[PDB]
Design a protein around this ligand. Structure first.
Ligand code: HEM
Ligand code: HEM
Lengths: 443, 443
């Protein structure tokens, strides 16, 4: 299989037997994508073990894959690995099963359901503030991912299950047992030995820990709006499949939001003029520290620009991927069946062809003047098409609500322990090498 | 997975952990199907390892599976196992790849191409006769599968590749290395360890021997009408995929025809009145030992009845199977995705509900009077629907041509070594326990 791109005339790094190009992931696959783009141009191919992967960067071709030919050709992501019952999670499911799950779970994220959650998640924005004042009087720098993770977990639990637990002063199975998720050498052996995935499945081995899953399974059992929207009810949902969607939302609510929130606060700390301008917008829109509402959040243009520019620099998804279901010929190029088509979001977000000074944090990229010159298929922090991020609206609103409440009360500065410039971890996930610590001063 | 049929309300034999019901194959799976039909009625379910299999016997439901819902639900047979490049063989391919192969190879078996082969395969019918006279003068009984296999291999090679080799006096890679195909304990371990199939594939392990495949690969290479119909040319064929179809046809030409021919000659030997009546029809239609033609073969009604009644007693395919592609509800019954739907041809052919005295060889079942009372979905020796036997017309013509030439010259009788009644082998394939030996006397 390692002669595919050579026969297609498609350039790429020469693969090694068995391993493919996975050894070039020593720099992390975000640096691999950037170097491959620089060296091979618009399109290139490489191998994850034996799996051929075709990387595309042309906006026309990206839109054809993500949007135009989603249902007919590019329906599914690359198979997850040994999952067990998590095969029914929406982000893992394939074909008509995903179509049903996407249709059944879409009502959860409507702007009507979104407006209902804002009074619920503003109560934790005040607990988050009080928790911040505790360490603000301490005088020593704060670890943001701890307090933001507690906030994000509190928000996702109550909005999903209606359970209200202050995480910082306590909460274990969730959060404390949701974090885990290591960069094991097991995942590397999965791509080198993908033929072993059916072995681990029959041994009831899964990447998820069996004790937390059975906790949620029995947690939702004694639980007898997202939890309501599935219960009150294509085809009706199942009990064990009920739990699968909860794990995704919990992980997406906790891990994603709190990681991006820490990146934003880092950028605000290292750019005080941006922090001051954002604080001035918040005080103008919400005079006298008025509580943020659904409609006031949507009125803050500079807040939207700061969130967007941070998601440009740190697209936590790093890559978009779709499995080619059949032989196709897109935009003048032929894709054989079984090839994983990959869009390197991280490299595209930092490409000098579309971004001026791409490494610099400049929110004015997303101003109403310059936003029209931004291609929606180069800048894809939430993906695109029918399989984009279903919680995009919730994530943006959840992050902005936390940012407003936090900046109304505090200003953030670098401390002696702050890593400047921030160094990204090379172990897969888009996270800082050192945890982000910042000085917090009450306004 | 072993609780599926219990939750469906579908009866069946209680499966063992890991193994399923495969231990009940000690009697051979043809006896297993007959006993299950007798015990559980119209429908039942069992497990090949972890694989659930649903057996159906209602003619309405069979027609829905084989004919009505072939392209939408029941397109593919159960996956073959470790195949290697033989995954592109038409009888193994799935979905649109099978559709292309079925469309590209259908012109091989037209009645026009069939009429062209009759003058070609009549030359071996005369070599077969001369070979038979040699052992007829010997005076000792003859092993039919040897002389019929040589004939069938000669016919399939010349009709497929245009190569003309007298097999009996010689031919090795083909035939002598085509037979092999043992009832290994490896196939049993395949169903118990179906998760290991991707392991054997990556180790370049296949059920087919690697030396014969590369012989045909290089045989057809120096070969630079079936071989012509693919070369002279949906999507064009491939070199390594060229060889895959040749292996199927060679195996189907050799193994299938010669096994059924031996069953027919056994029945003729143990029913002299049937043999005499058939000989009288052949002498009436072809006076003075006239060579059989395409049109004279189709005129022999009693010849057709004898072939059909033998295929009722010995349907060498034993089972028809289709993988359920999606959740469906057929004829008032719900089939979940991934269940193998199986039609037990052997048991249906010997069911007292449709056949009087089912164990008895009675060609008058298929007379023009009684043939109308035969359901085409109970009697399915060549399958049915778009995925039936593509070589049905060729096989029937090839067998009848051999039978005519053989019975014009010889009469067949049991000898002291003849096994009466014939005992079927319990090791999977529908073949006699003892090889069929018969006394051959020149007319
Ligand atoms: C800053 C926060 C987030 C970012 C940047 C983000 C980004 C993404 C991206 C890029 C995808 C893949 C899109 C594609 O393949 O085209 C995705 C998928 C998904 N996200 Fe998010 N996401 C975020 C937060 C969330 C949240 C808070 C939730 C739920 C509470 C969520 C639920 C999902 C689901 C269910 C999918 C899979 C959808 C499907 O396969 O149909 N995400 N996300
Ligand atoms: C007495 C002789 C034969 C019998 C009883 C027989 C029976 C069958 C049956 C029952 C099937 C499966 C049908 C289904 O699944 O519905 C089949 C498939 C097939 N047979 Fe035969 N067959 C015979 C001879 C031959 C010959 C001589 C050839 C070629 C030279 C051949 C080529 C094929 C092929 C290619 C398939 C698979 C077709 C597909 O999957 O589309 N068969 N046969």
């Amino acid at each position: 299989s390692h002669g595919l791109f050579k026969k297609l005339g498609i350039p790429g790094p020469t693969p090694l037997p068995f391993l493919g190009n996975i050894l070039s992931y020593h720099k992390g696959f975000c640096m691999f994508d950037m170097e491959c783009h620089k060296k091979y141009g618009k399109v290139w191919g490489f191998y994850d073990g034996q799996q051929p992967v075709l990387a595309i960067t042309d906006p026309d071709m990206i839109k054809t894959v993500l949007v135009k030919e989603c249902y007919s050709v590019f329906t599914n992501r690359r198979p997850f690995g040994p999952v067990g019952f998590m095969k029914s999670a929406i982000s893992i499911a394939e074909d008509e099963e995903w179509k049903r799950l996407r249709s059944l779970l879409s009502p959860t994220f409507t702007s009507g359901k979104l407006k209902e959650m804002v009074p619920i998640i503003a109560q934790y924005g005040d607990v988050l503030v009080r928790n911040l004042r505790r360490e603000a009087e301490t005088g020593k720098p704060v670890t943001l991912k701890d307090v933001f993770g507690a906030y994000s977990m509190d928000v996702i639990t109550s909005t999903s299950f209606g359970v209200n637990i202050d995480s910082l002063n306590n909460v274990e199975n969730t959060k404390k047992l949701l974090r885990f998720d290591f960069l094991d050498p097991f995942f590397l052996s999965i791509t080198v030995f993908p033929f072993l995935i059916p072995i681990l499945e029959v041994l009831n081995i899964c990447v998820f820990p069996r004790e937390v899953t059975n906790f949620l399974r029995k947690s939702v059992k004694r639980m007898k709006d997202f939890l309501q929207l599935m219960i009150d009810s294509h085809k009706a949902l199942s009990d064990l499949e009920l739990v699968a969607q909860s794990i995704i939302f919990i992980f997406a609510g906790y891990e994603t939001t709190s990681s991006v929130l820490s990146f934003i606060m880092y950028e605000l700390a290292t750019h005080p003029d941006v922090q001051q301008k954002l604080q001035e917008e918040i005080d103008a829109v919400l005079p006298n520290k008025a509580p943020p509402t659904y409609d006031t959040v949507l009125q803050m243009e500079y807040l939207d620009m700061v969130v967007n520019e941070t998601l440009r620099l740190f697209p936590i998804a790093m890559r978009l991927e779709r499995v080619c279901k059949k032989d196709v010929e897109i935009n003048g190029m032929f894709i054989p069946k079984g090839v994983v088509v990959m869009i390197p979001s991280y490299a595209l977000h930092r490409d000098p062809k579309y971004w001026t000074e791409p490494e610099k944090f400049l929110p004015e990229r997303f101003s109403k003047k310059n936003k029209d010159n931004i291609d929606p298929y180069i800048y894809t922090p939430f993906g695109s098409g029918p399989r984009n991020c279903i919680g995009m609206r919730f994530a943006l609103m959840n992050m902005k609500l936390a940012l407003i409440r936090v900046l109304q009360n505090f200003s953030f500065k670098p401390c002696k322990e702050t890593q400047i410039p921030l160094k990204l971890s090379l172990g897969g996930l888009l996270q800082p090498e050192k945890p982000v610590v910042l000085k917090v001063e009450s306004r």
